[PDB]
Design a protein around this ligand. Structure first.
Ligand code: L7X
Ligand code: MG
Ligand code: MG
Ligand code: MG
Ligand code: MG
Ligand code: MG
Lengths: 320, 335
């Protein structure tokens, strides 16, 4: 993302806060409105904002050059901030589950994106497709979070649940829909691209990119150079654990059963030692090459009048 | 009405099928979501859902009241019950309550706990899927979507304002003012309990006049305030549900009026004993409420508020039916 893109995007955030905390309306509840301004200011604008900026990039690469006015690029930025409000509601739910922030702040921040959509988009043709997309992505993300939770019982990982089929479903529902599909489908709708076949072709490639993203992330959690990775300690349904269980003989399976998802640092080292023994680094190297090649092929094959450069830009951001 | 109740209840199983049995690659989580809906949504009294059907039947032109349109009103009623189910799942986790209406709180069930947050967000999100299935081709679609999102935002402001009356599990009695109490009841309860069912009935009847919605809101916020004050009164003085508002340190009408009427010695009793777990501390507060004559004060408020609201309903103008607001009044005041 360019300096211009990053700065124009960040310039919108203070307007979003004023919009949601009823600036100019003279509210009967100033103390709780002032608190909500702090909830937004403290939790929404501080990250890398990759999902929000991806919404702007998608719109710029899908729209006709002649329709790329400062006004339309700003609307794309506002949609990007709606994605970042959803991201913030999900990160807040994570902070609450890990332990100023109240439990209902995640519901409140999620609800706030619909107020922003109504303010800026209610008179445009893309309004109902956009609100229906957010509704559907919200429901699917909740299904993904619940599927992830069904891999744990009484504080212990259920290793029988750690299948590649279940892993692929968790990544798709919990992460890929809101992280990869939502920004691109928002860009398409703002560019008045409603063709189901176009949305379907984009979704197919973006779910593939999303799966590589999460597998790379899972690999680096254990084998990256250090934040310090806690997936093993937390008993997470990670690609490493799924492939470990595929490759394990009964003795190796017993090591996973005894030491996976334990608080003792020694147990994390025992699992890392097993991942090394099982050749998960070499397996990841093969997956990375084969997955990159398949995704590059599918992007080159993209039809229905969709631009390739958008998907290559997204892919190159993940693989580098 | 028996017929109205049974008609309404007959819709629920279809809504569960719409949300779980219509994502074929993830059956374990759709089966679980059916159980979340079945536990939290259809048990006990469905007053808000049924009030949506009643409001519609009193707002719509008699000739337009088909079984099909009455069923759409019922589906909107269930969307209100879906919103309520989401709010109470979350509130019970926040307040660490044991039961609601005798049922163990959802978050307390095996292997839920803080996963109740995801279930809250999931149940709330689900009502928009119901709206899309049944209303996407009707003119009322976007107004109804916008009303649900706006009421959710306002209800969250109410819950957060309620929380600003507590610090580290201790009530902040300086926050217990009638103006703060009125604002909590308006945002936290009255919007989703009273405004939402009536505004849904109006939209389904193609009544979009902002002035009509404004006139309805003014009366329904007044009725909503008496409703919660009566509820607060009966928590302490009702004949045994067992009231735990004092133990929980709630910003109740009783606590607010007690602090208004208290001399400095009586204030110190509230400061020492309000929101404490000890049964003797609840007894001390109840005894203070009796000493301060809160029963007589409630009796006077009940009479005066009934007369003021009745006068305000007589003065309602535009097309709004007076009989709807009198019927709601009769249901709350029981006269
Ligand atoms: C946003 C959000 C989660 C709102 C909850 C609204 C409601 Br309704 C909360 C219930 O209110 P309260 O806890 O004061 O009494 P009780 O639990 O019925 O005894
Ligand atoms: Mg990770
Ligand atoms: Mg409660
Ligand atoms: Mg509460
Ligand atoms: Mg009560
Ligand atoms: Mg209670």
């Amino acid at each position: 993302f360019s300096k211009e893109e990053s700065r124009e995007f960040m310039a919108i955030f203070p307007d979003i806060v004023r919009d949601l905390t009823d600036a100019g309306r003279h509210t009967d509840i100033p103390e709780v409105t002032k608190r909500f301004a702090k909830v937004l200011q403290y939790n929404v604008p501080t990250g890398k904002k990759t999902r929000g900026l991806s919404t702007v990039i998608a719109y710029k690469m899908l729209e006709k050059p002649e329709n790329l006015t400062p006004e339309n690029v700003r609307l794309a930025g506002i949609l990007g901030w709606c994605v970042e409000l959803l991201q913030a509601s999900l990160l807040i739910m994570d902070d609450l589950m890990d332990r100023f922030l109240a439990i209902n702040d995640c519901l409140h921040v999620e609800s706030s994106l619909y107020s922003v959509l109504r303010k800026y988009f209610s008179h445009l043709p893309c309004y109902v497709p956009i609100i229906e997309l957010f509704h559907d992505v919200n429901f699917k993300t909740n299904m993904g979070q619940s599927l992830d939770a069904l891999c744990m019982k009484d504080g212990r990982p259920i290793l029988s649940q750690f299948t590649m089929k279940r892993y692929s479903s968790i990544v798709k529902y919990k992460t890929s829909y809101y992280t990869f599909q939502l920004p691109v489908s928002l860009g398409m709708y703002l560019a008045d691209m409603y063709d189901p076949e176009q949305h379907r072709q984009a979704k197919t490639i973006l779910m593939e990119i999303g799966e590589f993203f999460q597998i790379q992330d899972d690999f680096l959690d254990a084998f990256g150079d250090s934040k310090v990775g806690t997936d093993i300690k937390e008993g997470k349904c990670s690609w490493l654990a799924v492939v470990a269980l595929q490759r394990s003989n009964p003795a190796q399976r017993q090591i996973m059963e005894e030491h996976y998802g334990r608080p003792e640092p020694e147990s994390t080292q025992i699992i890392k030692n097993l991942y090394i023994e099982l050749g998960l680094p070499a397996t990841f190297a093969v997956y990375e090459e084969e997955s990159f090649n398949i995704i590059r092929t599918h992007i080159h094959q993209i039809s229905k009048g969709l631009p390739h450069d958008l998907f290559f830009k997204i892919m190159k951001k993940i693989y580098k």
